[PDB]
Amino acid sequence: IIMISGANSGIGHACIKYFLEKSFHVIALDINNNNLIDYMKTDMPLKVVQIDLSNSEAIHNLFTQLDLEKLSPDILINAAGIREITPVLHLSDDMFKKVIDVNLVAPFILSREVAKRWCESKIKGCIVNIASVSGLMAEPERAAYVASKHALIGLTKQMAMEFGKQNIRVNSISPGVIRTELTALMSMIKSNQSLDTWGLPQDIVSCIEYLISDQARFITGSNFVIDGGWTAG
Amino acid sequence: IIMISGANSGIGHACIKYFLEKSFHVIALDINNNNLMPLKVVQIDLSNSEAIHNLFTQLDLEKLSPDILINAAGIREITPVLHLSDDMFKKVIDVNLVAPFILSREVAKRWCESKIKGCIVNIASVSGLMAEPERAAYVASKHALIGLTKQMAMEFGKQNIRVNSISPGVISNQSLDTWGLPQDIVSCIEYLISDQARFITGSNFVIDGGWTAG
Amino acid sequence: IIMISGANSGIGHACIKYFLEKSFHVIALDINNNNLKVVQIDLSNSEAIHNLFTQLDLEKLSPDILINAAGIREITPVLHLSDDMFKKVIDVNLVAPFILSREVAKRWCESKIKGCIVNIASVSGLMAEPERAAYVASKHALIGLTKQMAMEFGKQNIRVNSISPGVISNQSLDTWGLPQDIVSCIEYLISDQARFITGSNFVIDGGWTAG
Amino acid sequence: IIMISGANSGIGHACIKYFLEKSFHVIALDINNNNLMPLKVVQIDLSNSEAIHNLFTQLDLEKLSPDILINAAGIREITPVLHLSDDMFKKVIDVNLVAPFILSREVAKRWCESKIKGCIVNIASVSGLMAEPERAAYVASKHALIGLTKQMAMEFGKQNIRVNSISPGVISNQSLDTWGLPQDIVSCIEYLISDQARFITGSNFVIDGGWTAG
Ligand SMILES: NC(=O)c1ccc[n+]([C@@H]2O[C@H](COP(=O)([O-])OP(=O)(O)OC[C@H]3O[C@@H](n4cnc5c(N)ncnc54)[C@H](O)[C@@H]3O)[C@@H](O)[C@H]2O)c1
Ligand SMILES: NC(=O)c1ccc[n+]([C@@H]2O[C@H](COP(=O)([O-])OP(=O)(O)OC[C@H]3O[C@@H](n4cnc5c(N)ncnc54)[C@H](O)[C@@H]3O)[C@@H](O)[C@H]2O)c1
Ligand SMILES: NC(=O)c1ccc[n+]([C@@H]2O[C@H](COP(=O)([O-])OP(=O)(O)OC[C@H]3O[C@@H](n4cnc5c(N)ncnc54)[C@H](O)[C@@H]3O)[C@@H](O)[C@H]2O)c1
Ligand SMILES: NC(=O)c1ccc[n+]([C@@H]2O[C@H](COP(=O)([O-])OP(=O)(O)OC[C@H]3O[C@@H](n4cnc5c(N)ncnc54)[C@H](O)[C@@H]3O)[C@@H](O)[C@H]2O)c1
Numbered sequence: 001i002i003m004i005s006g007a008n009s010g011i012g013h014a015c016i017k018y019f020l021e022k023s024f025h026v027i028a029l030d031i032n033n034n035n036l037i038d039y040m041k042t043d044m045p046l047k048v049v050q051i052d053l054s055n056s057e058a059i060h061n062l063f064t065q066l067d068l069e070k071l072s073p074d075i076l077i078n079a080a081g082i083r084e085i086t087p088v089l090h091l092s093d094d095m096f097k098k099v100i101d102v103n104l105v106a107p108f109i110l111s112r113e114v115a116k117r118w119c120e121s122k123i124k125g126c127i128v129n130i131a132s133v134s135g136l137m138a139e140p141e142r143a144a145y146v147a148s149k150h151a152l153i154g155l156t157k158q159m160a161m162e163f164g165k166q167n168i169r170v171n172s173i174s175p176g177v178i179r180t181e182l183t184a185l186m187s188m189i190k191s192n193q194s195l196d197t198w199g200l201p202q203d204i205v206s207c208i209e210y211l212i213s214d215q216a217r218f219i220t221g222s223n224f225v226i227d228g229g230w231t232a233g
Numbered sequence: 234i235i236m237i238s239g240a241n242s243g244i245g246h247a248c249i250k251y252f253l254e255k256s257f258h259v260i261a262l263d264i265n266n267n268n269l270m271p272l273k274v275v276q277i278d279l280s281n282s283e284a285i286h287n288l289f290t291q292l293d294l295e296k297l298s299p300d301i302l303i304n305a306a307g308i309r310e311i312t313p314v315l316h317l318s319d320d321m322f323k324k325v326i327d328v329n330l331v332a333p334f335i336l337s338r339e340v341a342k343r344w345c346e347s348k349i350k351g352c353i354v355n356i357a358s359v360s361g362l363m364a365e366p367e368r369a370a371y372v373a374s375k376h377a378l379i380g381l382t383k384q385m386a387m388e389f390g391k392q393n394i395r396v397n398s399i400s401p402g403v404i405s406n407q408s409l410d411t412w413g414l415p416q417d418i419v420s421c422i423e424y425l426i427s428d429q430a431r432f433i434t435g436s437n438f439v440i441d442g443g444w445t446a447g
Numbered sequence: 448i449i450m451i452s453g454a455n456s457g458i459g460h461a462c463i464k465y466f467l468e469k470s471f472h473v474i475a476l477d478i479n480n481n482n483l484k485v486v487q488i489d490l491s492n493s494e495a496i497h498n499l500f501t502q503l504d505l506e507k508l509s510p511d512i513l514i515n516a517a518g519i520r521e522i523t524p525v526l527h528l529s530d531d532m533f534k535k536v537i538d539v540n541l542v543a544p545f546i547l548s549r550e551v552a553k554r555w556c557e558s559k560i561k562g563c564i565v566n567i568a569s570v571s572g573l574m575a576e577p578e579r580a581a582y583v584a585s586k587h588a589l590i591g592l593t594k595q596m597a598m599e600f601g602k603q604n605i606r607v608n609s610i611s612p613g614v615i616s617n618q619s620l621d622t623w624g625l626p627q628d629i630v631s632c633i634e635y636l637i638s639d640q641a642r643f644i645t646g647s648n649f650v651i652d653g654g655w656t657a658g
Numbered sequence: 659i660i661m662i663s664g665a666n667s668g669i670g671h672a673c674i675k676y677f678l679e680k681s682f683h684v685i686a687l688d689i690n691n692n693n694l695m696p697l698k699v700v701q702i703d704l705s706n707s708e709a710i711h712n713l714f715t716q717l718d719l720e721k722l723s724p725d726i727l728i729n730a731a732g733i734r735e736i737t738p739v740l741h742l743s744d745d746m747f748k749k750v751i752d753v754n755l756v757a758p759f760i761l762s763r764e765v766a767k768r769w770c771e772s773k774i775k776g777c778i779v780n781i782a783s784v785s786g787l788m789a790e791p792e793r794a795a796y797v798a799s800k801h802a803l804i805g806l807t808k809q810m811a812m813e814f815g816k817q818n819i820r821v822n823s824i825s826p827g828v829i830s831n832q833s834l835d836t837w838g839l840p841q842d843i844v845s846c847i848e849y850l851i852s853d854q855a856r857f858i859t860g861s862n863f864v865i866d867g868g869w870t871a872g
Contacts, residue, residue, distance in 0.1 A: 087388075088338060088341070088388045088389075089341060100330070100331070100377075104326070104373060104377070105319075105323060108322055108369060108370075109319060112315065112317065112369075116315055119315065134380075134872075135380065137383075138435070138871050139384070139872055140387055140388055141388070143334060143381060146384040146872070147330060147334070147380045147381040148377065149380065150376045150377050150380025150381075151326075151330070151373040152373070154373045154377070155376075157364040157372070157657045158314075158364035158365070158366075158369050158372040158373065158657075159314065160619050160654050161364055161365070161366055161619045161657045162314045162366055162369070163314075163619075164618070164619025164620045164621075164653070164654050165619070165620075193601065194597050194601025194602070194645050194646060195601050195606075196604075197642060197643060199643050202640075203640070203642065203644075206638075210635050215628070215632075215635075216631075217628065218613070218620065218624045218625070218628040218652070220619055220620055220653065221619060221654040221656065221657030221658075222649070222650040222656075223650075225646075225647040226647070227646075227647070228644075229597050229601050231594075231647075232594040232595075232598045232645070232788075232789050233594055233595070233785075233789030233797075364657055365658050383868075383870075384871075384872070387871045390832065390833020390834045390835075390867070390868050391833065408812050408816075409815050409820070409857065410815070410816055410818070411856065416854075417854070417857040420855075421854075424849055429842070429845035431836070432836060432839075432842040432866070433842075434868045435864075435866075435870065436865070436866070438861070439860075439862075440857055440858055441861070442858075443815050443860040444860075445861075446575050446809075446811050446812045446859070447808055447809070447860075493744045497744075525763055525809075525813045525814075526763060526766065526770065528763065530707045530760055534756060537751065537755070541798060542744070542748060545794060545795075546744055549739060549740060552740065574808075575812050576809070577812050577813055578813070580759065580763075580809045580810060580813070583805045583808070583809040584755060584805050584806045584809065587802050587804060588755070588801050588805070590801060591786070591797045591802070592797065592798040594788075594797070595789035595790070595793060595794045595797040595798065596739065599738075599739045599792070599794065600739075
């Protein structure tokens with residue numbers, strides 16, 4: 001059982017399809033589901049929850065439903081995220097906070113909750129946080145985004161230490177520019193990379209597969225940068 | 234004119250005495266004032282953003298705007314993560330990240346409108362570079378702050394607004410055989426705000442007795 | 448074809464085993480050989496490297512993939528660490544990766560062919576330790592070098608990445624790392640699934656660098 | 659007494675004026691001397707480690723042990739990496755990394771022997787934190803030097819020997835509209851050797867006008 005946030009789009013949605021193909025049971029979290037409706041009509045082992053991850057009450061109601069339905073996820077993938085592009089002086093309090101509530105607070109809460117159940121059961125859990133190269137190098141017009149992505153890397157490290165004794169591994173992936181719904185400008189992207197190729201969702205999906213695998217037994221608290229050389233210098 | 238949050242204790246408090254004694258006009262922000270000349274002391278809960286907005290309404294009525302922001306208000310939970318509630322996680326984030334962001338946006342706005350230089354110094358921590366147990370919020374919030382620092386340094390650089398951070402160690406795991414003291418952090422602030430710091434922006438100054446070395 | 452330095456021991460030897468088993472033409476380089484082209488070479492000798500490349504230019508053998516795993520760790524108080532012991536660690540741990548990396552990249556650029564280099568660094572490339580001045584300098588240098596060479600050769604599809612093993616209490620996890628944790632990472636990093644990965648350093652360390 | 663490599667040019671040079679003018683006895687170390695009061699000038703190739711060992715034998719016989727060491731001698735190749743030869747890479751390493759290693763071990767030996775409380779500053783670079791085109795040896799050497807700073811800080815910390823580095827940017831890819839000047843490096847050196855730097859070691863001070871910010 002693998003629980004994936006941001007399931008309606010981009011990376012999270014490429015994960016939904018990939019992991020259903022390899023016979024995982026998938027719990028999909030997203031605030032929209034227009035791009036999951038078709039799959040909901042099938043008999044695939046797919047539980048879709050509609051949920052505003054910025055509402056921490058709704059996150060409890062999620063865990064109430066999972067407990068009552070007897071779903072303990074084995075893996076959590078925190079991919080849901082938002083990103084502002086607005087001058088910092090135009091960025092309102094609420095919207096700074098929204099970006100924080102989705103990108104940082106929600107991963108923390110979902111992580112505390114799955115980890116509570118894993119601790120209680122002696123299960124060997126796995127968590128992957130999708131941060132960003134904005135968690136390492138800043139960008140203009142992105143105060144909250146950079147802040148939130150730096151915070152999530154930090155959080156990954158902290159929570160790896162908190163739960164390592166229980167063999168719950170917690171890692172992050174920091175994508176560079178990946179072509180999804182979230183994303184002249186193209187030549188600027190390339191001029192800031194080393195590779196002349198576009199980042200795709202499959203590059204992140206593959207990294208997740210590596211990091212949830214048995215081969216990743218000794219991997220915790222690390223940040224895997226998947227960015228075509230953006231952070232190189 | 235320097236604005237200092239966390240003025241009622243430790244690093245912020247030590248900054249009060251020191252810049253008053255250097256002849257600065259001081260605006261002191263803290264939720265407590267028991268521990269508190271050109272000194273405006275404000276009793277304020279900095280996790281309440283409505284109260285930061287009202288502070289600025291008062292400051293604009295007073296035609297009083299800071300040249301310098303020191304974000305030293307801060308809280309550290311010590312709680313096992315399973316016992317760290319939603320609200321406490323968020324409170325730590327609202328004090329340690331959201332309040333520096335709001336205070337910084339606000340003083341940046343007025344520096345940009347007045348076309349005046351400005352300087353912000355953010356008090357982070359070594360917990361911004363290295364995690365520790367029982368510190369989910371503290372660590373995430375301090376990391377976030379370091380990232381906030383670099384971001385706003387980039388945002389405002391062209392307008393000559395410098396934004397830097399300091400990451401103190403503790404004020405065995407150290408390299409030096411001495412205690413970190415408040416004055417070690419004050420001296421670095423003094424440096425970061427000075428004319429000698431004209432070319433320093435987006436930098437994190439670690440003052441930690443070798444704690445982060447290895 | 449894959450070239451692996453440090454082939455006689457630990458991480459390098461584990462790779463020889465795995466990549467034969469996977470059908471690769473392996474080229475092992477090492478000073479010792481007591482444990483497939485096997486070359487006995489001291490990599491701290493720059494003219495031996497140039498000769499290996501001479502020989503290899505005559506045999507048609509230029510690797511598709513390079514794995515710099517040859518390394519030595521002094522454990523020496525820094526006051527007793529001689530000039531020559533310091534240069535040697537630097538010559539093996541840094542200079543040789545660079546010479547070996549420049550040489551394969553030369554042939555890849557000429558042939559207009561993709562290449563892949565994985566540099567075995569260390570968590571000592573990120574966090575210092577006492578009594579390891581050369582080692583820590585050298586592994587910090589190699590992380591630097593990986594990023595620089597990732598930039599240098601990106602637009603020729605030459606990918607350059609590194610791995611920072613922990614030890615193969617100061618960790619988060621209660622197990623010991625194994626040469627296979629590092630081999631599995633090298634495998635991932637040379638895969639077609641790593642098309643987008645360059646300049647990155649992969650930490651594989653049980654949480655050692657976490658905090 | 660302050661020992662300064664690279665004393666003939668740029669940052670080492672500007673340190674010569676500066677610390678002479680503040681009453682330090684200075685030992686200038688460089689391979690050239692055309693741009694060079696209690697001053698001892700040594701013409702020395704810092705890539706030749708026999709000569710270094712010589713200098714210190716001599717200095718011991720003159721009972722001159724420096725109190726402070728500034729490692730500023732440096733070289734940057736700008737050369738495409740396919741044209742960077744073995745010798746060229748080794749030379750950059752020998753100057754930028756090996757020499758500061760040796761000079762540092764040599765002055766620490768004497769501080770430990772005499773029970774002095776010494777101070778070392780390493781002049782690294784933003785290329786110690788970020789790669790650039792055509793700078794394989796420079797980038798590797800400068801990353802090496804940050805790493806050595808942390809390690810020797812850890813080694814000699816029980817002996818109150820502080821080891822720190824500074825990472826100059828350029829002395830558009832910056833956030834500030836401005837050039838670094840040697841003085842920005844010199845003031846930072848002055849701060850790191852001071853009594854207010856008592857709790858500072860292992861640290862890396864970036865002075866780059868936002869280059870590394872993102
Ligand atoms: N695409 C990129 O270039 C890129 C690069 C680096 C990092 N990232 C990060 O990767 C992750 C996914 O990015 P993507 O490109 O797939 O984005 P995307 O916008 O295509 O999809 C993100 C999904 O998150 C969901 N989400 C947002 N807010 C939510 C809420 N409050 N409750 C529930 N769901 C919510 C969205 O609705 C969406 O379906 C994010 O964490 C993002 O910051 C993306
Ligand atoms: N002392 C250390 O070991 C250490 C180390 C690294 C970083 N720090 C950081 O340095 C800064 C100052 O720490 P300190 O040791 O001086 O702490 P302290 O507890 O002595 O002082 C912090 C002050 O912040 C104030 N504060 C907390 N919440 C507030 C709110 N909601 N509104 C207004 N004020 C509030 C407190 O009332 C207190 O006066 C903080 O950012 C802290 O995280 C401290
Ligand atoms: N095992 C660990 O805990 C660990 C941790 C971090 C990094 N590393 C690094 O991984 C790499 C391999 O590690 P290992 O555990 O396999 O060490 P090892 O001693 O088991 O293997 C090193 C190999 O490198 C070869 N080598 C050393 N000097 C040489 C020279 N001058 N010329 C040619 N070959 C030479 C040795 O002969 C040996 O076969 C090294 O770069 C090392 O620094 C290891
Ligand atoms: N200027 C910048 O923008 C900048 C940026 C980042 C880092 N740095 C670093 O700052 C330090 C000083 O830089 P600078 O700009 O003053 O450089 P520079 O070239 O102006 O001066 C360096 C000096 O080191 C000396 N030197 C070189 N090789 C020597 C040898 N083998 N023996 C003795 N002396 C030798 C040279 O003769 C020269 O006088 C260096 O370590 C450099 O890498 C400078």
